[PDB]
Design a protein around this nucleic acid. Sequence first.
DNA 1: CCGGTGCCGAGGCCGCTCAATTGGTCGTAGACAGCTCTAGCACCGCTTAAACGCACGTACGCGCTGTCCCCCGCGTTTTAACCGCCAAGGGGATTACTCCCTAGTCTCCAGGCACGTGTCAGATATATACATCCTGTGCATGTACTCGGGATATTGAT
DNA 2: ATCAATATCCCGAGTACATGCACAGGATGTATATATCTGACACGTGCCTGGAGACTAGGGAGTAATCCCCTTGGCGGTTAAAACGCGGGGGACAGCGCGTACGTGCGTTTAAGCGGTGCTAGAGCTGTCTACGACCAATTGAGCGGCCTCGGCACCGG
Lengths: 79, 82, 93, 99
Amino acid sequence: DNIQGITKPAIRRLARRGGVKRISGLIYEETRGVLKVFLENVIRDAVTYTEHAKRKTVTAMDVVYALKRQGRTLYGFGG
Amino acid sequence: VLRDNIQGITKPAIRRLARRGGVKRISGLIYEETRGVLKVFLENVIRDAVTYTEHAKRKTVTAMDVVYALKRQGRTLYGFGG
Amino acid sequence: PGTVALREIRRYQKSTELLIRKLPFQRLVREIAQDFKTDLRFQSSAVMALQEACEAYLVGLFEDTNLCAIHAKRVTIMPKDIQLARRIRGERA
Amino acid sequence: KPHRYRPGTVALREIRRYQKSTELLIRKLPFQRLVREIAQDFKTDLRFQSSAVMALQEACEAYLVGLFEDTNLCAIHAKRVTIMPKDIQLARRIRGERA
DNA sequence: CCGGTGCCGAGGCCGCTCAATTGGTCGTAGACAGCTCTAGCACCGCTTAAACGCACGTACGCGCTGTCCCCCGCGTTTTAACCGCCAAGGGGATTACTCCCTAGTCTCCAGGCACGTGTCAGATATATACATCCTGTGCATGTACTCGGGATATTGAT
DNA sequence: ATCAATATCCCGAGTACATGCACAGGATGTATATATCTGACACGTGCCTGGAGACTAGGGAGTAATCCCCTTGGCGGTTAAAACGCGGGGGACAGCGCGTACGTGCGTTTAAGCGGTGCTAGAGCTGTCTACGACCAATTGAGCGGCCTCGGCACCGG
């Protein structure tokens, strides 16, 4: 059990960057679901890329390639 | 009469499309707004479809051109070629 | 009242035809394409594909608009819903 | 006796404070443990580059910020200021994830 | 005076009577199966030639692994602006009707540009010798983060 | 319609790791020359997209009655926010070693070329024959009607 590592004030901070004033108290348990699901896809690709190169270490380029295949491009990590 | 053809998209047509979408009630301000939206879409496809016609040095726009234009916008169309 | 509309709703969700008259759509497409270049010629399949794609886009838009209207405890759809749907989908702002 | 602030002004203060800085919010160690346990659940005995996990963290934070922005638009559309999960479901469905 | 009892008024039962719905049959016509070459043409069989893909060591850093300290999370309290529910006024989108009109059919006409082939020539792959621009390494220093203290707002309670 | 209590911004000083530049060099960009076929240009061709005519009628534009959903306003309950104290785990520094990248050597494997030949494609008119139009008889359902039974009030009796 480590999804609880995403503490409540962390969710509050993430919400505050978005520009929301009031947070319901039951939001967190559902929001931790979204973090649970959106993260279960890139890793699906990230390990798989790793498994193509006969290597068992997840390099910083595999996650970039996964996020590119999904439609979210990021800069600054060797893209 | 000299009338713009965007008004050629009749109100009953928009109501039919909405009813196919699954809506019970339609406010009266949708009718002018939807046409505007329908403009913007056609401003992002024909523009591409003409450019391909430029690149082939042709004068007639073919169905393959519009299919390729729709393909690049993540709106792939099936059954009209390609 | 309020049930003859549902009759249509059920009827149109089964039939699969073109809900826009062909001639006005052709005139609209020609007039829109006039600005980019004068004296163009159009394949008939191109016009049919255009109309099919536009109708599919509008149907999806109205589906999302209905979801938006239901969210706000309403039954009538207003431009306040279409703008929200376009904004949150990603075609504007 | 002690000076108390109105409920809501501290909210905008935090909004302005966080919308200017660009530090990582989630604590690094819990995020690393979470991704490690998920990876082991998929494939055991895996090694992770620190740059890789920080890029996963930044991608997740960007996703969450965009999701919460859309949620805020959904909540304001319903004549409200508090965000409830129905707003998140509506946003997630219109974007085209969930359904 | 109060109470039994008839008369009338209302609630309950049952049933058609009639008007709207939906699967079944008739029927005819343009379009899915299905040869028929053909036709030339991609696909297969049969050869070699070269190179990239693969495996073995082997050098060498970048991830895991162990120890102190406070900063952020947890948990409590009160209280208040917001959520949710309810209710009434009224506007407008709905529904139905008659009347107009341009979509739809198809027919006829014809000239513009898709489309293929044939010709030929110059732009581009390719090999080799030349050489210099970009890259890893090393190192001075200064723009910027941090700490501390005094301005100017910036809110709340009388 | 202001005064206390915080929070924030501004400025100054000690401090440091990362930017920016010079150096040695090496391997990839460049100049020269050859082969050659891909694509510019011209030609005919004939498909088909564009223009106009007349007739049918499904569909749209205009009007009127109206019941309903929309919106504004008001109130009760409470779910979160703001700030206090308590408590634990994130955060900041050294030692192993196992992974990842080069280096070196080998052979399996695709590209290329050239006959060989079934094989997918197009128009042929082929003929059936499902499936789209028109008509018609099945059940389902709600809006009504007839009659009977129950209950309350006015009238007469003791």
